């Protein structure tokens, strides 16, 4: 199984490399060659979830058989027996093993600095270039630093 | 199964490449060569959902057999027994494995900037060029940036 773990590491590294390639394909025309640096971290879960759900519909029952005895005298006896049929959904789901659980991307732009408007524009391009998903916990940093 | 995961990555990359090709086929005449850059992120779910639904119709029962005893004297006894037949739908669905769960497209247009009207027109063309589906969670960014 350790060979499987090794190949999982290979998958994660391949994903990171592909994302880096896309980042380059976007930023190389916009910024130029050597005016930026970017690295990508991709964390992938490899669990084996397998779920079975059996759901009913309480608010729409359908009476199948029914008995109702109601006699008076004073005495009032109200017996009743009822059998129901209910909407039944049975869903069996099997999640894919390797899923990107969190994605971190950081891009540093060489100074000569960059204005806030262009930094936010680059961030907007990257959002969509990488597939930024904040609800997944992903993080995207864009900074303007001084290259040596 | 890790080979299957590798081929799933290949499928996702192929989808992204096809969408990029369509984006180019639309924008190359409109904008020109080298006046734009665009990248596409496609996230695909590969679950194995398999659902079985059994639904009834509570509001239209059909009486199959019926017994009704109603005697008086004062004393009033009202016995009743009833059997019903109901509309029964049984649907077994099996979803396709790989489905595009979210799609992100970002396009950056070289300045010399672009007016808001033409930006929105390009966005309208892309909506339909790519098959934008906001209800799916898809995202489409169109920006006017300064190429270096």
């Amino acid at each position: 199984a350790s060979a499987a773990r090794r190949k999982e590491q290979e998958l994660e590294r391949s994903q990171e490399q592909a994302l880096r390639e896309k980042i380059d394909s976007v930023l190389l025309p916009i910024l130029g060659y050597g005016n930026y640096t970017a690295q990508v971290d991709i964390q992938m879960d490899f669990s084996a979830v397998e779920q079975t759900r059996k759901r009913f519909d309480p608010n729409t029952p359908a009476t199948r058989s029914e008995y109702a005895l109601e006699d008076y005298n004073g005495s009032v006896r109200k017996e009743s027996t009822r059998n129901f049929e209910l909407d039944t959904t049975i869903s069996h789901e099997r999640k894919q093993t390797g899923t990107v659980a969190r994605q971190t991307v950081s891009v540093a732009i060489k100074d000569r600095p960059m204005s806030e408007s262009e930094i936010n524009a680059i961030r907007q391009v990257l959002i969509g270039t990488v597939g930024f998903d904040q609800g997944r916990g992903d993080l995207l940093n864009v900074l303007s630093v001084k290259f040596a | 199964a890790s080979a299957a995961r590798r081929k799933e990555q290949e499928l996702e990359r192929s989808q992204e490449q096809a969408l990029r090709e369509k984006i180019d086929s639309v924008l190359l005449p409109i904008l020109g060569y080298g006046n734009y850059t665009a990248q596409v992120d496609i996230q695909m779910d590969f679950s194995a959902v398999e659902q079985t639904r059994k639904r009834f119709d509570p509001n239209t029962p059909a009486t199959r057999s019926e017994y009704a005893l109603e005697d008086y004297n004062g004393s009033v006894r009202k016995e009743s027994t009833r059997n019903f037949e109901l509309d029964t739908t049984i649907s077994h669905e099996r979803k396709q494995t790989g489905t595009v769960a979210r799609q992100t497209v970002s396009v950056a247009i070289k300045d010399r900037p672009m007016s808001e009207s033409e930006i929105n027109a390009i966005r309208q063309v892309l909506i339909g060029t790519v098959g934008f589906d906001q209800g799916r969670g898809d995202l489409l960014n169109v920006l006017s940036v300064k190429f270096a």
């Binding site: 199948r64 058989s65 027996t81 059998n83 129901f84 | -």
Partner: peptide, 12 residues
Amino acid sequence: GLSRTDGRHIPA
């Protein structure tokens, strides 16, 4: 009565 119900108990 119809014990048809997979959980029919009323029976009677």
